[PDB]
Design a protein around this ligand. Structure first.
Ligand code: MN
Ligand code: MN
Lengths: 148, 149
């Protein structure tokens, strides 16, 4: 919606039913102490961590946990979440006040977005995961084979 | 006086399409080096983590990260995981060698068990989620209102 949201949604590849759901995920507490992303981030943290270990398990030509922890630490790293975030230019949609966006914050909004997509889609974890793979399964896969 | 190998499906309310997927989850290295639950439990960690957290987020009274976290470390602890497995008599079904099973293998088999369901199901996160909740949604909410840890 609005003169902005519609554009994040086309990059996202998903249009929301509840627009304020999307907005809450992009909004820093500095902007609204009443409706900001902290709780969605909490959810999206577990959600995304799940999406990525799934790809990790599914792929990865080595299956011992001893191999899986390292790339995993990377794939959930703030550095890698910023990488995927860049594919949506998320810095551009975040709602913030007295202060500037960060990698960390971009990292937390990213988890928040996915939690609201999950929820907005009626808590549809299979669709959400696929949305996620459409967008990022390519990088995640290139990552695993030692992609800087 | 029957149903030794399993009974566990009727507990879960789910019949596996591939039995060796359920077998794999309940199998520890000491019994089978070929297929033990190691990789599933890795998945299962992340799987059950999200089931619990999703519940936590909608049902806890305080939606602040401050209050959610200490509850969350409880609800995904081996201790509590065990209390969830006791409802499955999971120990009963584990294919483990020697005499020491322990509390770490069990919550781990608990973890690898909901990952095997996930996968057997054709990766249906939603169905697996509800299947999970039908069995423990009860105890998770409860534990939220008492608030431990
Ligand atoms: Mn975060
Ligand atoms: Mn574990």
């Amino acid at each position: 919606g609005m003169k902005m949201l519609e554009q994040l949604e086309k990059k996202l590849g998903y249009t929301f039913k509840d627009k304020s759901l999307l907005e809450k995920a992009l909004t820093h507490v500095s902007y609204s102490k009443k409706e900001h992303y902290e709780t969605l981030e909490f959810l999206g943290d577990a959600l995304v961590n799940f999406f990525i270990v799934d790809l990790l398990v599914q792929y990865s030509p080595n299956k011992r946990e001893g191999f899986l922890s390292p790339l995993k630490a990377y794939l959930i790293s703030e550095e890698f979440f910023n990488l995927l975030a860049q594919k949506l230019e998320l810095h551009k949609f975040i709602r913030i006040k007295r202060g500037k966006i960060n990698e960390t914050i971009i990292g937390d909004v990213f988890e928040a977005l996915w939690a609201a997509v999950y929820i907005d889609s009626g808590r549809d974890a299979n669709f959400t995961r696929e949305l996620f793979y459409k967008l990022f399964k390519e990088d995640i896969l290139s990552a695993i084979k030692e992609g800087r």
